[PDB]
């Protein structure tokens, strides 16, 4: 259920769990939606509402990209996501949801990472994590603004090793995606 | 449209998760006087030592409120706008009975969820009027009325020294004495006294800091 | 204007609550339109807290035959391979329910799709019949066989529109199409749609899943897959084989 | 570990009684001479009652210089249960026996505070509404031989067990002269 | 309503060989206070039908208004609505039961118990009962409230089976009902001495008696 | 808060014969240890060789029967007086029961009739709409006594297939008699509807009037 | 003759209860993209945990007008409520301004609110879908 | 009733006599134990010769009285002076149709040429009863026996005035929610008369 | 009041007249809406010319009355005939010292050659009050005003009998828990006299 | 005396995982007084909840050879209280060398029941004869007693009371009193589900031995 995000000087690395639902065992990613060719969204929280919200956001962003024949900036995407999340709970009990948005602004050629909680509080962060009750110790002590992609991957591997030290066999693994100037890639070895 | 109910469920969810004055009115033989204290407290702390608690609905119709301050101010302003529009439409001096009816119906519409307890005094061509209005939509008529946390001392003073035929000066003195007793004997009342006197055929006289 | 005049002219009908069109339709007073709505209408109490009322008036066991039936759900396992999809359930039950034929624990949505039953039995039966009708209408409209993903998403949206109302159902849609291949989706009443390759649901799901994972291969044989499914079931027995031509029952 | 709960069946024959209990050691039936008692409920309270009744029956035999009769034992159990009026044991006891002087079989049952429930046909304790009391009533026939009574009680136990897994039963057949103890490891 | 405020006590009825007899006391109690002493709880509807309502007074008046509207509408635009169009007790009871069930399904029930008695067109006796939940049932003898626990045992000793109806005369049934009313007055705090009676017969047709008081009361043994 | 539910405590039994069907029901209405009524119909004839019964809340069962009869009438009107089949009636009853999913009926329903093959068919419906086809189905408090009695004598695999209408009626009457002798809420009467290719036959057997 | 609004709850619910936002692919399900409600708002959530005053406020003026019409019918006859309703319907139907939501002057004159202000008037009340003139035209003309 | 809402703990007595009707009440409004108003006019005029007294919630009763007065003005604009039965019917309909949300009880005293003065009572729940006389309020419970023992039909004006004065004096004496002055309205064929009695008058009876 | 007990809802009166005292009561004991005992002698005697009537909880009042009779027997053995004041003091002490465990209220009537008849009332709580007349019970609230309007000092025996009969008849009429017959005990210099009045006699008043 | 041990343990078991076994809660009881004695009758059918447990139950308790009682409520409490009061009455009669009186048993029962503040659930009808005459009393579980001529108790007490109000008069014979008591018990049996089977009767007359009849109806 843990979602992680590290913003290195030229890339965004998003990590998520593989799959877990109720007490049902499955083999089988269903927690990351590609909003834009250079913008990715990772969502965690209650099952049933988070997926619907992510699909709604992805549909809206794809419609905007089709209409304008242009790619919306990660900041505008984050603002739209925050507004939609705040609107969704304006007339009902709030549901647990945490969203990490990682993008690469082409106009400024800069990676960006944003975190939105269940009430709709968008915060721009160099690194972010949810679902862990800590893990910020490694993310704070060994973080630099000028870290390369390899260094960020090594830090993420250290965090994953820490996770795979106090968890049962249910921890299948970690799915890792990288957003940079060349687009969105998936990391298999790490 | 109107007052919103959005984020009501969100507010309840946050609450479940640990996320958180003396007024008198005296009617004398040719008019009405309304007096109030001038201290605003945010609990134990005195926020303001000189606050105007006498609000105006019409040039010759004034009121003073208690309960929820925002609700009292909003309802008074809305009724003032309605009264001004009605007077412009009819080209006549507004009546205290019309303001009473509008306030009563508006307060009964919300079934007591708008907390505003008012003393409304005024003078219109039919005479002088003084009413007390409850937050649920019930109104009462009297010759002398008191309101607020210091209303008991004020009522004692009014009962001590009230007569049928009172002059303007006697009524002003009686209202000032009632507010002074409320100020001295009640912790929530203090500072100065604000007075508003309304006679028949004369402009309303508004005296801030009548007794400092 | 004449209708306006009629609407303002007049007691006995009002007390019978026949002045409402919904009451007339539900009692078949003027026609059979109640059986003409493709999307069924569900009755709720006219009170401030329908959900807690239903929960309190459902969690009250007084009559064994007045309770809501619950699906067996002992152990059901589904997997896919090059030859299609193998689904295995338990033929375990008696309870004063003597019948000519055995109880069917797998819903036959259509000659090409299968739906596992779990949780509330009535919810699964009703909503999978509705899903089959929707899929048939879609096939008639598009002149093509509807994909399993489309049907699973339709069911997921349907169960999500009533989330928290009181539905308790969990199903596994299994199908085989030329467009996609073999597909298995899991949809529960919460609103979770999950595509998978190996699924095990029930009390003895852990042992069956372990047995399956011990000797699971994409490239196998139909006999090998059926034997593996039966062994996984018996570790904690009806069998279904779904291919492009449809589903065939291999119960034993 | 579990142990709590159980079933006790008492039936009267011609000149004999039959008392039977279920079993997975720990047996719910204890004898204090020629009187048998079966207790259903918490294992701790069953053991406490067994120890207390062994104590009291040993003292009774030492003083009276004779064995205790089923009626006197029934009265003793009733009084002992009523002593803990506000702290009662979570038990249901059943007493069976043969009066050594008149020969008339005796069976009785009690609630948790010693209200005597004496029945002339049969008594069921632990579960008396699911599948035991009705089947015992259907299978009961008065004035049966000891072998017929044993067969009836074994059939009743088997019927209750069916309505398979690890199951056993202990049955005592009591005559005026000798007592036969049998198991049902089926 | 959510809860009744002013309530009645009980209505008791039974069948005899030629018809039915029904009775109910006249009292409206405001909690523990016997407030009103002029409430009539037996309504003669039509020619040979009587409805007895026990419970909330406002809902009883609402039901009386409904019955009056039914009577007026049945005879509306029908100059010959006196011999073949006369309302039968079965139709009135069916309407009342449907109304009660529909309002129960609306979560806004009528806090009443209703007993309908009369003689059908073919001379058959009719006697049925319905409650606020809408559940209806029929029996040779019927009662509501405390009368369901004290008056019913007294009446069943006269008519215990269906075959006992032809053996029961009008005098016996009337005496039994009067005795039941006296017993109720003995052992009911909310009861009243005054009561009203209605006899529906297939020969005479109807007889409604008001201002009836419980007589022959025995209190002399209290002297000791 | 107002409670709109209740129970009346009946007993119903439906048996699918080789060329017929039997639906029997008991009469008793008592609550809070007080006797209210002993005579009320429990088995209704819906026509088209379909017989229906509902046990539980009396008002709920009456409303369900009324709705089904109105639906059958409209189906006859709108389809040139076509006869309704047993499975179509079962589907209609399932939809009627599930239309109240969040305000459920507190009743249990059993229907019986003849299919297109002429063989007796019986369907049992769960309170919210789960229906199934069974040869024999007993509902109520006395089902736990009636069902073992039937299972002891006849076999559903004297075999039930070769049983006659009179034999099945006798067996049902004896089962109700045994339940009355053992239970305490069965008696007064027994209303039986028999569905054959010639129509529907009513038999009211008078048990003890206790 | 009501004062406080009554019978504000819904007896039944359905997935296609709002015909204006039906999905074209599956006409028996709502279209979440065109709803623009955030995408995580099932209809069931609209049945529980509501403020006990929202229904009273949203149906207050309608209830008052219905009571007034009932009084007119009782005292004056059918013609007076018929004429009032006819005038109101004629005024409402002939006004179509997709670029504004403010009521017409004639409507306020008929409702006797020429010189009356409530919080509805003070507070009358981005999206990529369904906020153009064409959607309002389709809603108005039933297309 | 709702939390913090004013309740009408009054003493109301309507009596019909040979020449019409008299409706009397006290003048105290309380807030539990503190007297909010020593002098109140509880006699509400709905029509020129149709008056009423209210109990229960003050706001609900005031709204109902205003609506009934508006309805009677509309009726008078068409068919002239209404009757007490019509006003009682309107009150009963308003109270019964709104009993699920409003707490209100009314006592209506009227006069007309046809009926020569009548009294109606509408307690909580919305049922209308026509009585020769009616008593209501917190203090009314203390004078049930006294009123029952000392009521006659077709009394004179002074006899009815004395009866109401004595009964209301006792109700004021034994009840803590009843106030100083007694206000009575006499409705007869001659017109409407208003009478007021002070504590120093009736306390010496 | 402990749950499931029996409440003594009744109509109790005690009136002092020229020649002594008279204590009157009804004879109804109810458990909810059911009259458990319609013939009940509520005139408890604690001494030859000292009587009492009880209210509250039946068990507590009976225990207190038994203890008071024991105390008065000891006093009579030691010093002779006690006065009504002594019995009232014992009652008050017993009721006050156990007011946190027992709910009891007593009305004590007595006679002696010195004081010539006295009435005392111990309500719930344990306070004592000496009055020319006393009323108590659930049905008393309806006759308060009546009792305040028809009591005179130094009435004759017949006048007191009629006054008590009328007041208790009204209380029975207006109270649901009051009914049956009226029992009266007359304590004078001559002795103790018992009177019983049946419903057919006082209901015609 | 009675132990309070394992009270906290029982509360913990009830609040966590266990259900305390229920106690038998006993059923019509009647008492009719005739010119020269009393008759006490009771129903003989005892049911364990909704299931009949016995068709012949002896609910008539003996305090003295001429003082009998019938109890409702907790059966164990009724039996224990009656036996204790009977032992006390026997000891008192031996001490005074006189026939016991009904008033003494009434006083003992009342004081004992008031001692436990209603925690002993026994509601009794006590009839008897003694040198002072024939007496009939009703005793509540909280320690309050009442005197009457005819009394009824139990679940079907309303039907029995209706029958008694129907057919009771001051001058009655032994046979008429027995018939009236039997009719009241029969009405309670027929019109209520809590009573059934036969009737136990005990007749106590002045100057004669008490007569105990089991299964009077057959």
Curated annotation (Swiss-Prot), chain A:
Keywords: Acetylation, Cytoplasm, Nucleus, Phosphoprotein, Proteasome
Pfam families linked: Proteasome
Keyword Transmembrane: no
GO annotation, cellular component aspect: cytosol; endoplasmic reticulum membrane; nucleus; proteasome complex; proteasome core complex, beta-subunit complex
Subcellular locations according to the entry: Cytoplasm; Nucleus
SUPFAM superfamilies in alphabetical order: N-terminal nucleophile aminohydrolases (Ntn hydrolases)
GO molecular function, one term: endopeptidase activator activity
Phosphoserine modifications at: 73
GO BP terms, alphabetized: proteasomal ubiquitin-independent protein catabolic process; proteasome-mediated ubiquitin-dependent protein catabolic process
Presence of the UniProt keyword Lipid biosynthesis in the record: no
Major site of localization recorded for this protein: cytoplasm
Other known facts: Present with 21800 molecules/cell in log phase SD medium.
PANTHER family, per database record: METALLOPROTEASE TLDD, PROTEASOME SUBUNIT BETA TYPE-1
Known function: Non-catalytic component of the proteasome which degrades poly-ubiquitinated proteins in the cytoplasm and in the nucleus. It is essential for the regulated turnover of proteins and for the removal of misfolded proteins. The proteasome is a multicatalytic proteinase complex that is characterized by its ability to cleave peptides with Arg, Phe, Tyr, Leu, and Glu adjacent to the leaving group at neutral or slightly basic pH. It has an ATP-dependent proteolytic activity. This subunit has a chymotrypsin-like activity.
Family of the protein in this entry: Belongs to the peptidase T1B family.
Protein name: Proteasome subunit beta type-4
Organism expressing this protein natively: Saccharomyces cerevisiae (strain ATCC 204508 / S288c) (Baker's yeast)
Swiss-Prot record, chain F:
One cellular component term from this protein's GO annotations in UniProt: proteasome core complex, beta-subunit complex
Keyword Magnesium found: no
Principal localisation: cytoplasm
A Pfam family this chain is assigned to: Proteasome
Domain of life: Eukaryota
Keywords: Cytoplasm, Nucleus, Proteasome
Classification via InterPro entries: Ntn_hydrolases_N, Proteasome_bsu_CS, Proteasome_sua/b, Proteasome_suB-type
Cytoplasm in keyword set: yes
GO biological process: proteasomal ubiquitin-independent protein catabolic process; proteasome-mediated ubiquitin-dependent protein catabolic process
Family: Belongs to the peptidase T1B family.
Family annotation (PANTHER family): METALLOPROTEASE TLDD (PTHR32194), PROTEASOME SUBUNIT BETA TYPE-1 (PTHR32194:SF2)
Described function: Non-catalytic component of the proteasome which degrades poly-ubiquitinated proteins in the cytoplasm and in the nucleus. It is essential for the regulated turnover of proteins and for the removal of misfolded proteins. The proteasome is a multicatalytic proteinase complex that is characterized by its ability to cleave peptides with Arg, Phe, Tyr, Leu, and Glu adjacent to the leaving group at neutral or slightly basic pH. It has an ATP-dependent proteolytic activity.
Protein name: Proteasome subunit beta type-6
Taxonomic lineage from the root: Eukaryota, Fungi, Dikarya, Ascomycota, Saccharomycotina
Gene, per the UniProt record: PRE7
UniProtKB/Swiss-Prot annotation, chain G:
GO biological process: DNA damage response; proteasome assembly; ubiquitin-dependent protein catabolic process
Cysteine disulfide links: none
Description of post-translational modifications: Seems to be degraded by the proteasome upon its formation.
Polar residues bias spans: 8-26
Keywords: Chaperone
Superkingdom of origin: Eukaryota
A GO CC term assigned to this protein in UniProt: nucleus
Region (Disordered): 1-35
Comment field (misc): Present with 2740 molecules/cell in log phase SD medium.
Family (UniProt): Belongs to the POMP/UMP1 family.
Entry-linked PANTHER family: PROTEASOME MATURATION PROTEIN, PROTEASOME MATURATION PROTEIN UMP1
Its job: Short-lived chaperone present in the precursor form of the 20S proteasome and absent in the mature complex. Required for the correct assembly and enzymatic activation of the proteasome. Also prevents premature processing of the PRE2 propeptide.
Protein name (database record): Proteasome maturation factor UMP1
Name of encoding gene: UMP1
Curated annotation (Swiss-Prot), chain J:
Pro-peptide positions on chain: 1-26
Function of the protein: The proteasome degrades poly-ubiquitinated proteins in the cytoplasm and in the nucleus. It is essential for the regulated turnover of proteins and for the removal of misfolded proteins. The proteasome is a multicatalytic proteinase complex that is characterized by its ability to cleave peptides with Arg, Phe, Tyr, Leu, and Glu adjacent to the leaving group at neutral or slightly basic pH. It has an ATP-dependent proteolytic activity.
Originating gene: PUP1
Reactions the enzyme catalyzes: Cleavage of peptide bonds with very broad specificity
Keyword Cell membrane part of the UniProt annotation: no
Domain of life: Eukaryota
Name this protein carries in UniProt: Proteasome subunit beta type-2
Additional facts recorded: The side chain of Thr-27 acts as a nucleophile, and the N-terminal amino group acts as a proton acceptor.
Biological processes, Gene Ontology terms: proteasomal ubiquitin-independent protein catabolic process; proteasome-mediated ubiquitin-dependent protein catabolic process
Entry's EC annotation: 3.4.25.1
Included range, full protein: 3 to 220 of 261
Oligomeric and partner information: The 26S proteasome consists of a 20S proteasome core and two 19S regulatory subunits. The 20S proteasome core is composed of 28 subunits that are arranged in four stacked rings, resulting in a barrel-shaped structure. The two end rings are each formed by seven alpha subunits, and the two central rings are each formed by seven beta subunits. The catalytic chamber with the active sites is on the inside of the barrel.
Principal subcellular localization: cytoplasm
